[PDB]
Each structure stands twice: as structure tokens, then as C-alpha cells.
Design a protein around this ligand. Structure first.
Ligand SMILES: CCCCCCCCCCCCCCCCCC(=O)OC[C@H](COP(=O)([O-])OCC(O)COP(=O)([O-])OC[C@@H](COC(=O)CCCCCCCCCCCCCCCCC)OC(=O)CCCCCCCCCCCCCCCCC)OC(=O)CCCCCCCCCCCCCCCCC
Ligand SMILES: CCCCCCCCCCCCCCCCCC(=O)OC[C@H](COP(=O)([O-])OCC(O)COP(=O)([O-])OC[C@@H](COC(=O)CCCCCCCCCCCCCCCCC)OC(=O)CCCCCCCCCCCCCCCCC)OC(=O)CCCCCCCCCCCCCCCCC
Ligand SMILES: CCCCCCCCCCCCCCCCC[C@@H](O)O[C@H](CO[C@H](O)CCCCCCCCCCCCCCC)COP(=O)(O)OCC[N+](C)(C)C
Ligand SMILES: CCCCCCCC/C=C\CCCCCCCC(=O)OC[C@H](COP(=O)(O)OCCN)OC(=O)CCCCCCC/C=C\CCCCCCCC
Ligand SMILES: CCCCCCCC/C=C\CCCCCCCC(=O)OC[C@H](COP(=O)(O)OCCN)OC(=O)CCCCCCC/C=C\CCCCCCCC
Ligand code: HEM
Ligand code: HEM
Lengths: 79, 120, 51, 62, 106, 378, 49
């Protein structure tokens, strides 16, 4: 089939691993990731935020506006 | 061959576990006899034994006499075999090396997975 | 069917008995833990879920 | 250095899978009762007085 | 018809070159293109010296994204440096596909 | 000799769930489809335990639901789990569609289409099961939504008469929906198996989008524990949303017994349909509202033909990704507009939201894909 | 893109295979007339009833 035994050509690329037991699970797991998280963040907040903020603004836009077409009516309907 | 890479492995680790649990004494004496033959076969000739003198001294010291070696082969029992094999084969981290192409060969954990039978 | 019989097989079962017998004990006590079986829980000083 | 109590504890129950399952079973049996009753007495303790089990006294044994 | 303004085009294509993240992983532009079967056969056309380079770079990036950590700041590709090796291959694939189609239509 | 390769069934599982080659660089988004696979069986057993009491009669059903919520031993948990759990199903399902669209796993055409048919199937099962509990929203909702097909110049009004089995909602129509509702999920299972069967023999997609055939990696050592962790955390989401937010997920009003007589103030359709229902507000002529309604789901099929940008994905292209997020935002729009009681500003916003909802993909995406191609010799 | 189909050999295929298209389409039309009890075309033929 497409199983590992016969696939793409690949050559003199080499692997260096470690036995899981010989190494601890959390190698500087804190300090390394935070700048990464924050950089990914500053990377994509630019491309994620504006639809959602525009949505929130239209949300309160229509809610508050129509609400002003709603609660305020008796003066709008005059005496 | 590329398509059977895992397969030899698939059996090989079992052999180690085979040595762990259920190591028949008949197999033990088989291995001992082949071992004794390996010694006597090594010790034919002048150069090999000059080397034996030339290395045994660096090792234990001594020429370590064959009467001792064969007393020490008679020394072995299947219980002791299963114990030592347990102390090295049964759950211990492999150090594996390959030059192929390798691709069928299982990744380390999977390889590591075989060092211990789930049944034991 | 007679094949099961054999000099190694006697020794072999002798060898495998601890591992599989252990499972039965583990399987039995665990099954008691799963059905929360009564009368043995009478015999445990600690785990009396009963008042 | 000398092996940790945890270290020899490996050579004990962990390395053998049957005993491993065994300690999983006894461990379940203890974690059950202890955590269960812990959640008991604590839940009893937090929002105290909302409980009627302590308010059974208005109507029990006369 | 564009000519005098072309500078600024390049001045945003580079930004567009920045706009894509592949430079941050440093991969060749040719690597990015999807492998439909014909372009696959164009991949087949490649010399091994060029082939394994591609394969290795790809595996590097594939390891990175698994860690999510980006390729190091120093190594990031320049817009000039990224050889577009596949051009003869793919352009001939186009020429040949459109060839056999060009006969197929008559 | 080899055990997994011994038995042919085991050969199949080993070609798949035991050790199918997989890309390594996979993130949680791919964990989500597996999460769908998680939810499905859970709803099935949960609905089984529910099927041990519920009745499809016009009269006796609701009393049996009350038999569930109050009589049954911890069955209330089951009740809410089937409900809220279905809600979770749609949760993950939506993310999943978003993924396949985003990383371009729709490039696997047949797999994709089976996903589509599977989607319509899930929608129908949703609707009918929602009709089942038997309450005010159940009644008037099912009635109103069923009425839509009458927009057909000839056949559809006839057809509603055929579903109902009578003049109106009744033990006829209700038992009808109970049975369709029951038969479909099992169909969904087989479509799932078929779906994966298309997936295996093309290989899985990767986050990069670009092929990772060179980096294919064993499934069992790695992704199994990954997806186990993912399912356990969804189990957190669900259990926290059920033991701490038992009711909020749905629409109270069903809690009132249905009356063909008594008529509910607002009849908001349950939330996953809200965007769809919003589109019912979109245009004059109920017929065209039905057309656009079906088109809202149908339109997905165009995309693989509409796709032309060189990515098989959408992560190295923040450009088109921006159009993407405009489209997702647009879905949020149709959602919240569908949630509100009908009003004129909501009407115009829903109009332009709908036009743009079609046009981002019928206009913006392909052509911007073309200019994006022009920028770098694509 | 779609220009490849736009050829004299293919338009040829159109001219060759069109009557057959009318054939099968008429067949399924009649099937609609029959199985669905489509009385409107059953009315076109006197022999019915
Ligand atoms: C419930 C609804 C279902 C959806 C939730 C998904 C389930 C959670 C999950 O997937 O596991 C975490 C999962 C683990 O990381 P991962 O699997 O390696 O992500 C791979 C992505 O393909 C690679 O994409 P990504 O993970 O890098 O996401 C990009 C993101 C960068 O954000 C992240 O990478 C993770 C940030 C979330 C944690 C926030 C800080 C910790 C508290 O940048 C943005 O899109 C906008 C930036 C502004 C967000 C603020 C982030 C830091 C504060 O993170 C996610 O992908 C989920 C999305 C998290 C970002 C949401 C931002 C909301 C504002
Ligand atoms: C019918 C006649 C029955 C014949 C049974 C003969 C005994 C051998 C046997 O049962 O194998 C299972 C296994 C033998 O494993 P082994 O001794 O290491 O040798 C297997 C070879 O490696 C064979 O090589 P391998 O590559 O197949 O080993 C990989 C691993 C297979 O592991 C996998 O990769 C499958 C993972 C699928 C999970 C997908 C999750 C998706 C979310 O081996 C297993 O089949 C054990 C998986 C444990 C779950 C049981 C699955 C049964 C279906 O025996 C046991 O698991 C029983 C002890 C522990 C069970 C707890 C019992 C408490 C009561
Ligand atoms: C679908 C809808 C949602 C489902 C909701 C359920 C969510 C479940 C999620 C819970 C997570 C379960 C985690 C599984 C734990 C183990 C996973 C696996 O990776 O561990 C293996 C290990 O397996 C475990 O060690 C075996 C433990 C045996 C305990 C069996 C439990 C018995 C339960 C029986 C059911 C009783 C109830 C019956 C009612 C009818 C790997 O072994 P290894 O990492 O290499 O270490 C052991 C190596 N040795 C042998 C050398 C020591
Ligand atoms: C009498 C004898 C009875 C013995 C029967 C024993 C069967 C009990 C449990 C069998 C379930 C198998 C699933 C286990 C998954 C798993 O394999 O986890 C890894 C672990 C060890 O694997 P390796 O290290 O690779 O082994 C190599 C040994 N040389 O195996 C385990 O048994 C641990 C199980 C933890 C993983 C949990 C995930 C298992 C899959 C769950 C999917 C099930 C979905 C089915 C839903 C259907 C609903 C109708
Ligand atoms: C009503 C409430 C219902 C709740 C349903 C929840 C669905 C809303 C999903 C919104 C989640 C917002 C968080 C987004 C996080 C984010 O921005 O991730 C960034 C990341 C960029 O990653 P890279 O491309 O790899 O770049 C790496 C750079 N080095 O972007 C992505 O993750 C995109 C892939 C995620 C797809 C999932 C989208 C979820 C939205 C689903 C709705 C859309 C589907 C429409 C189909 C409807 C058909 C009827
Ligand atoms: C609950 C029913 C479904 C199941 C079991 C199913 C299989 C799920 C799962 C398990 C994956 C594979 C990726 C993974 O989870 O690791 C994905 C296969 C796929 N499904 Fe479905 N699917 C289901 C409903 C849908 C729907 C409605 C669509 C939308 C059209 C869809 C589009 C895909 C795609 C594109 C893949 C290929 C995986 C990939 O390339 O990443 N699926 N989904
Ligand atoms: C994923 C597909 C399914 C969906 C969308 C679905 C609808 C779900 C949901 C939404 C509930 C409704 C609970 C409520 O609204 O209060 C339940 C309706 C129902 N489903 Fe299904 N169902 C699905 C598969 C099944 C299966 C497989 C069974 C039986 C084994 C089943 C038995 C029920 C019952 C009895 C109800 C009505 C429960 C009530 O009155 O609250 N469902 N399920």
C-alpha cells in the first residue's frame, strides 16, 4: 500500500533522538514558550482582531440604535 | 530488504522477551554447547592464543584457564538466565542505529514498546 | 490436542503461572472494586463506604 | 547517589506489569474512598447551613 | 503597460514576500506550490542534487512547525536567493498539457 | 507469525488506527475531526438510554420526558448530555468545517463531498430530534420550518401534507420524525466509515498544506494519546457546561407543553440554525428564501473549483485569510441577526451580510487568488 | 481555462450524441409519466382510463 515500506526518495538525512525516560518532560517549558506565544500573538492579532471588533461594534450599534428606536418611542410618537 | 525491516525487528525483540519469560533449559544447553564450541574454535592456532594471553592479562589479569571457563559454563542455569535477561532485556532503553534506507523501521517509542511484553 | 503435552510445556506453564495468576488476583480484586462487591468490603478496615 | 525510595519502588511494582496493574487496583480502591469522603466532608463544610442533614434536628427523635 | 511604477510593485511584492510566512521558514517559493499529479511528474524531473536539498529543507520546516518555534532570525530567506528551479519543468508541463489538449480539440 | 498482519480485520485496523502513516506537524485543529468521532458514539449511547423511556405519541411523550428528568436514576444527566452533547457535536463540527476549508483539505474531492452529504444528514437529524422533546418550540418550530417547502409551485405543499401524515402536527407526524431521527444517525456512522476510507488512500492533510509524505509518522505511538487528551479536555468542556450550566444552551419554551392553540411570542429556532433561519429573513419570496437556504450549504461544492490559489491551505496567505475572517465574521453576523426578533435594520444588515457571504467566495477569493498569483509568478 | 472543451471535435461529439440525449431524456420523461402517476402527461394519451 502507501505504508512506510515504500514511499518517497530521501537520502543522507539523519535523526538524533533520545529515550524519553532519560530526559525530563519539561525542558524550560515555561521560559521558552512565552516569547513564542507572544510573538505568534503579535503576528496574527493583526489578522484576527478586526473582524471581531467590527462585529462587536455593529452589535452594540444595532442593539443600542434600535433600542433608541424602541424605548424612546412615546416621545417619537408625540402627544 | 526494505519491506521486511520492521518484521525482523517484530520478531527480534520478542526473542529477548523469549529469553526473559519461558527460557527452556534445552535452549540453554543449546547455547552453552555452541558457546563451548566457540571457545575451542577460537583457541585453535598460535596467534589466537598468543592474543588470548595478550588480552586476558589486560582484562582480568590471568590467562583465565578453560577449566575455569567451563566450570563457569556449567555454572549457568535457566533461572539465572532469566534473571540476567530480565536485568538487561526486560524493560531497558535501546540504543539503535541504522543505515539503509530505513523507513519501515519503528520510531523509538514503538521500538521501546517492544522491550516489555504487555502480557508481562 | 496432545501437542500441548511436553517437557518444556510443563516448565513453561510453570514459568508463566506467576504472571497470569497475578492477573487473576488483580482481575478479581479489581472486579470486586468495579461491582463494589459486598461481603469483602465488610472485611476492609478503611474503605467502608457504608456509614 | 543512593537510590530514592521511589527508585527502589520502581524495581518493585512498576517493572512487572501484573504488579503494576495490582497497585493500580489497590490505588483505585483507596483513591475512591478517600477522595469520595473528602468531597463529602468538604462539600458539607463549605456552604454550611444550607444542608438539611444538620437541619434534621427540627424533626428527628422527637 | 506598467514601467515607471514597477519599482513600487516590487516594493509591495517584497512586502507581499514578507506577507507570506514561508520566508520565516525560509522555504523556496517552488516548495509552496500544491502537488497536482502533473507538477508531481515535474518533481520527478528534478536532479537528485537539487531534489534532496528540497526534501531536507521541507523536513526542517516540518519539524519546526511541530514545535511551532520559528526558524532562526539569521537564516531567513532573501527575495533574491530563492532560486525558482522548477520553472523549466512546470512551464514545460503547461506547454505539454496544453499541447495534447491543443491536439485533442481538433 | 505477525499478529496485527495475521488477521485480515486486524490488517485493516493496522492499515488505519493502529499505524497508518501520518504527518507529524499536526495541531489541535486536526484533533477536532477525531473529536467528532468522539461525540458521535456518546450521543448514540446517550440517546439509547433516552430511548428507554421517550414515546413518540402526541399526548404521552412529554409526560415521559418528565419521567426522565425527575424519575430516572441520574438520567437527567443523560438527558442533558444528549442535548448539550449534541450541542457540543455541532460545536466541534463547525470548527471542523472551518479547518477543512482553511487548510484546504477539501482538495480531497470525494472525501469532501461525502463530508457534505454527511453534513446535510446531521442537519436533518438535528432538526427532527429537536422536534421530538415535544413542547411549544417543538410544535410551532416544526410546523413553521416544515411550511417552507410549500414555496414550491406544485410539489412541495403536497409534500408537507405527505410528511405530516395528516392535516397538522400529530402522533402521525411526531412518530414520523422519531423514526427518521432514529434511522439517520446509523446512516451517519456508515458515511463516516466510508469517509475515512476515502481519507486513508489519499493520505492525510498537513498544517503546512504542502505535502509531508517524506515526514509521515506512526499513528499509535503519537496521535492516539494526543486525541485521547483532546477528548478528555472536550469532556471537560461538556461536563462543565452540563453540571454548571444545565439549561442555558438551548431555548426555554419547549419547557412549556405544546399547544396548537397557544402560540409562543417569538419562536426563535435553536441556535445552530440561526444563521440559516436568518437567511429566511433575507429576501422577498419565500421560494427564493428556501433556494438560498439550501444554497447556503450547497455553495461549499463550488469552492474546490473556485479554489485556484497555489496554496493547498490558508496559513501562509494572510491576504486571503483576511477575506476568510471577513467571511467568518459574516457568519457571526447572520448568526446574531438570526437570533433577534425581526426588525428593519436587522433586515438590511442581513441582506448585505448575505450578499457578501456569497460574494466573498464567488468574487473576492478566486480573483484575489489570481492577483496573489500575479505577485509571485503563480 | 474551460476553453479546452470548446473545440470542433467536441462540438462534433455534441452533434453526434445529441439525438441519443433526446432519447434517454425522453425515456426518463416517460418514466416520470408512469411511475409518479404524472397524470398530466397521462392525460395527453387517450388510451389511459
Ligand atoms: C471553544 C471553541 C473552539 C475553539 C478553541 C480551540 C481549542 C483550544 C486548542 O486548540 O488548544 C490550544 C491550542 C494549542 O496550540 P496549538 O495547537 O499548537 O496551535 C496551533 C495552531 O494551528 C497555530 O495557530 P496559533 O495557535 O498560533 O493561533 C494564532 C494566535 C496565537 O495564539 C496562540 O498561539 C495561543 C494563544 C492562546 C492562549 C492565550 C494566552 C494564555 C492564557 O494568534 C491569533 O490568532 C490572534 C492573536 C491574539 C490572541 C492572544 C494570544 C496570546 C494572549 O492553541 C490553539 O491553536 C487554539 C487557539 C488559541 C488562540 C485563540 C486566540 C483568541 C483571542
Ligand atoms: C482469540 C484468541 C486470543 C489470543 C490472545 C493471545 C494473547 C496476546 C494478546 O492478547 O495481545 C495483547 C497483549 C499482548 O501484548 P504483548 O505481550 O506486549 O505482545 C504483543 C506483540 O507486540 C504483538 O505486536 P503488536 O504490534 O501487535 O503490539 C502492539 C500492541 C497494539 O497496540 C496498538 O497499537 C493498538 C492501539 C489501538 C487504540 C486506538 C485508540 C483510539 C482513540 O499490542 C496489542 O495488541 C495490545 C493492545 C492493548 C489493547 C488490546 C487490543 C485488543 C483488540 O496482551 C494484553 O494486553 C493483556 C495484558 C494487559 C491487559 C489488561 C488485562 C486486565 C484484566
Ligand atoms: C467516546 C466518548 C468519550 C469517552 C469518555 C471516556 C474518556 C476516557 C479518557 C481517559 C484516559 C485514559 C488513559 C489511558 C491510560 C494508559 C494509556 C497508555 O498510553 O498507557 C499504556 C500503559 O497501559 C497501562 O499501564 C495498563 C493499565 C491496566 C489497567 C486496566 C484498567 C481496567 C479497567 C477494566 C474495566 C472495569 C469496569 C467493567 C464494567 C463492566 C502504555 O504503557 P507504557 O506507557 O509503556 O507504560 C507501561 C510499561 N510497562 C508495562 C513496562 C509498565
Ligand atoms: C482474559 C484476557 C482479557 C484481556 C483483554 C485486554 C483488553 C483490555 C483493554 C483493550 C483496549 C485496547 C486499547 C488500548 C490503547 C493502547 O494501546 O494504549 C497503549 C498501551 C500500550 O501500547 P504499546 O506500548 O504500543 O504496546 C506495545 C507492547 N509491546 O496499550 C494499552 O492497553 C493502554 C490503553 C490506553 C490507550 C487508550 C485508547 C485505546 C483505544 C480506545 C478506542 C475505543 C473506541 C471504541 C468505541 C466503540 C463504542 C461502541
Ligand atoms: C455562536 C457560537 C458558536 C461557537 C462556535 C465556535 C466557532 C468560532 C471559531 C472562532 C475561533 C477564533 C480563534 C482563532 C485563532 C487563530 O487566529 O489562529 C491563527 C491561525 C493561523 O495559523 P497559521 O496559518 O498556521 O499561521 C502560523 C503563523 N506562523 O489561524 C487558524 O487557526 C485557521 C484554522 C482554524 C479554522 C477554524 C475556524 C473556526 C470558525 C468556524 C466557522 C467557519 C465555518 C463555516 C462553515 C459553515 C457551513 C454551514
Ligand atoms: C462526525 C462525522 C465525521 C467524521 C467521523 C469525519 C472524519 C472527520 C475526522 C475523523 C477527520 C479526519 C481528521 C482527524 O480527525 O484527525 C475529518 C476526515 C475529514 N473530514 Fe470529516 N468527518 C466527519 C463530518 C465532516 C463534515 C461535515 C465535513 C465538511 C465537508 C468533513 C470534511 C473532512 C475532511 C476534509 C477530512 C480529511 C481530514 C484532513 O484532511 O485533515 N467531515 N472529519
Ligand atoms: C448526532 C445526531 C443526533 C442529533 C443531532 C440528535 C438530536 C439529539 C439531540 C439534539 C437531542 C434532543 C434533546 C433535546 O432537545 O432536549 C436528542 C433528540 C433525541 N435524540 Fe437524538 N440525536 C442524534 C443521534 C440519536 C441517537 C443515535 C439516539 C438513540 C440511540 C437518539 C435518541 C434521542 C431522543 C430520545 C431525543 C429526544 C430527547 C428529548 O426529548 O429531550 N439520538 N438527540
Amino acid at each position: 500500500g502507501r505504508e512506510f515500506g515504500h514511499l518517497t526518495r530521501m537520502r543522507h538525512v539523519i535523526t538524533y533522538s533520545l529515550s524519553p525516560f532519560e530526559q525530563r518532560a519539561f525542558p524550560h517549558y515555561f521560559t521558552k514558550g512565552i516569547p513564542n506565544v507572544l510573538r505568534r500573538t503579535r503576528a496574527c492579532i493583526l489578522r484576527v482582531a478586526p473582524p471581531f471588533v467590527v462585529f462587536y461594534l455593529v452589535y452594540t450599534w444595532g442593539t443600542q440604535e434600535f433600542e433608541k428606536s424602541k424605548r424612546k418611542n412615546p416621545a417619537a410618537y408625540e402627544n | 530488504d526494505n519491506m521486511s525491516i520492521d518484521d525482523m525487528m517484530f520478531f527480534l525483540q520478542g526473542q529477548w522477551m523469549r529469553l526473559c519469560t519461558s527460557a527452556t533449559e534445552s535452549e540453554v544447553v543449546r547455547g552453552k554447547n555452541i558457546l563451548r564450541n566457540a571457545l575451542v574454535s577460537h583457541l585453535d592456532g598460535t596467534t589466537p592464543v598468543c592474543e588470548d594471553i595478550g588480552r586476558s592479562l589486560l582484562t582480568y589479569g590471568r590467562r583465565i584457564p578453560l577449566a575455569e571457563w567451563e566450570s563457569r559454563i556449567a555454572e549457568v542455569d535457566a533461572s539465572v538466565v532469566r534473571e540476567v535477561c530480565s536485568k538487561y532485556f526486560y524493560d531497558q532503553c535501546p540504543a539503535v542505529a541504522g543505515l539503509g534506507p530505513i523507513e519501515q523501521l519503528p520510531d523509538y517509542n514503538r521500538i521501546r514498546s517492544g522491550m516489555f511484553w504487555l502480557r508481562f | 490436542l496432545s501437542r500441548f503435552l511436553g517437557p518444556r510445556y510443563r516448565e513453561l506453564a510453570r514459568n508463566w503461572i506467576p504472571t497470569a495468576s497475578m492477573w487473576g488476583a488483580v482481575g478479581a480484586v479489581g472486579l470486586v472494586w468495579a461491582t463494589d462487591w459486598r461481603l469483602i468490603l465488610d472485611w476492609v478496615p478503611y474503605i467502608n463506604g457504608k456509614f | 547517589a543512593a537510590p530514592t525510595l521511589t527508585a527502589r519502588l520502581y524495581s518493585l511494582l512498576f517493572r512487572r506489569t501484573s504488579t503494576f496493574a495490582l497497585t493500580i487496583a489497590v490505588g483505585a480502591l483507596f483513591f475512591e474512598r478517600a477522595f469520595d469522603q473528602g468531597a463529602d466532608a468538604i462539600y458539607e463544610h463549605i456552604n454550611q447551613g444550607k444542608l438539611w442533614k444538620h437541619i434534621k434536628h427540627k424533626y428527628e427523635n422527637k | 503597460a506598467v514601467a515607471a511604477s514597477s519599482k513600487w510593485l516590487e516594493g509591495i511584492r517584497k512586502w507581499y514576500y514578507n506577507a507570506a510566512g514561508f520566508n520565516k521558514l525560509g522555504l523556496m517559493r517552488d516548495d509552496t506550490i500544491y502537488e497536482d499529479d502533473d507538477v508531481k511528474e515535474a518533481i520527478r524531473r528534478l536532479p537528485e542534487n537539487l531534489y534532496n536539498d528540497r526534501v531536507f529543507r521541507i523536513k526542517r520546516a516540518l519539524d519546526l512547525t511541530m514545535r511551532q518555534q520559528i526558524l532562526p532570525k539569521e537564516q531567513w530567506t532573501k527575495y533574491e536567493e530563492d532560486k525558482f528551479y522548477l520553472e523549466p519543468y512546470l512551464k514545460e508541463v503547461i506547454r505539454e498539457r496544453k499541447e495534447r489538449e491543443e491536439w485533442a480539440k481538433k | 507469525t505477525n499478529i496485527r498482519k495475521s488477521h485480515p480485520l486486524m490488517k485493516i485496523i493496522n492499515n488505519a488506527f493502529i499505524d497508518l502513516p501520518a504527518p507529524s506537524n499536526i495541531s489541535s485543529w486536526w484533533n477536532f475531526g477525531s473529536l467528532l468521532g468522539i461525540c458521535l458514539i456518546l450521543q448514540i449511547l446517550t440517546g439509547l438510554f433516552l430511548a428507554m423511556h421517550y414515546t413518540s405519541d402526541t399526548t404521552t411523550a412529554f409526560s415521559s420526558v418528565t419521567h426522565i428528568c425527575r424519575d430516572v436514576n441520574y438520567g437527567w444527566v443523560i438527558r442533558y448530555l444528549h442535548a448539550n452533547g449534541a450541542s457540543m457535536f455541532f460545536i466541534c463540527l463547525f470548527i471542523h468545517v472551518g479547518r477543512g476549508l482553511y487548510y484546504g483539505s477539501y482538495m480531497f474531492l470525494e472525501t469532501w463531498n461525502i463530508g457534505v452529504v454527511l453534513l446535510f444528514t446531521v442537519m436533518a437529524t438535528a432538526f427532527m430530534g429537536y422536534v421530538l422533546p415535544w413542547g411549544q418550540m417543538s410544535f410551532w418550530g416544526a410546523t413553521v420550518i416544515t411550511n417552507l417547502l410549500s414555496a414550491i409551485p406544485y410539489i412541495g405543499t403536497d409534500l408537507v401534507e405527505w410528511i405530516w401524515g395528516g392535516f397538522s402536527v400529530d402522533k402521525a407526524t411526531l412518530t414520523r420524525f422519531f423514526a427518521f431521527h432514529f434511522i439517520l444517525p446509523f446512516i451517519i456512522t456508515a458515511l463516516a466509515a466510508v469517509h475515512l476510507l476515502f481519507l486513508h488512500e489519499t493520505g492525510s492533510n498537513n498544517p503546512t498544506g504542502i505535502s509531508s509524505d517524506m515526514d509521515k509518522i506512526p499513528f499509535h505511538p503519537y496521535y492516539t494519546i494526543k486525541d485521547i487528551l483532546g477528548a478528555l479536555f472536550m469532556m471537560l468542556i461538556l461536563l462543565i457546561l452540563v453540571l454548571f450550566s444545565p439549561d442555558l444552551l438551548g431555548d426555554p419554551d419547549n419547557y412549556t407543553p405544546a399547544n396548537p392553540l397557544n402560540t409562543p411570542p417569538h419562536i426563535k429556532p435553536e441556535w445552530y440554525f440561526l444563521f440559516a433561519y436568518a437567511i429566511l429573513r433575507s429576501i422577498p419570496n419565500k421560494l427564493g428564501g428556501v433556494l438560498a437556504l439550501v444554497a447556503s450549504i450547497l455553495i461549499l461544492i463550488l469552492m474546490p473549483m473556485l479554489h485556484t490559489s497555489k496554496q493547498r491551505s490558508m496559513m501562509f496567505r494572510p491576504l486571503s485569510q483576511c477575506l476568510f475572517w471577513m467571511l467568518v465574521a459574516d457568519l457571526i453576523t447572520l448568526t446574531w441577526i438570526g437570533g433577534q426578533p425581526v426588525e428593519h435594520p436587522f433586515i438590511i444588515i442581513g441582506q448585505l451580510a448575505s450578499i457578501l457571504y456569497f460574494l466573498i467566495i464567488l468574487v473576492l477569493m478566486p480573483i484575489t487568488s489570481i492577483i496573489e498569483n500575479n505577485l509571485l509568478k503563480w
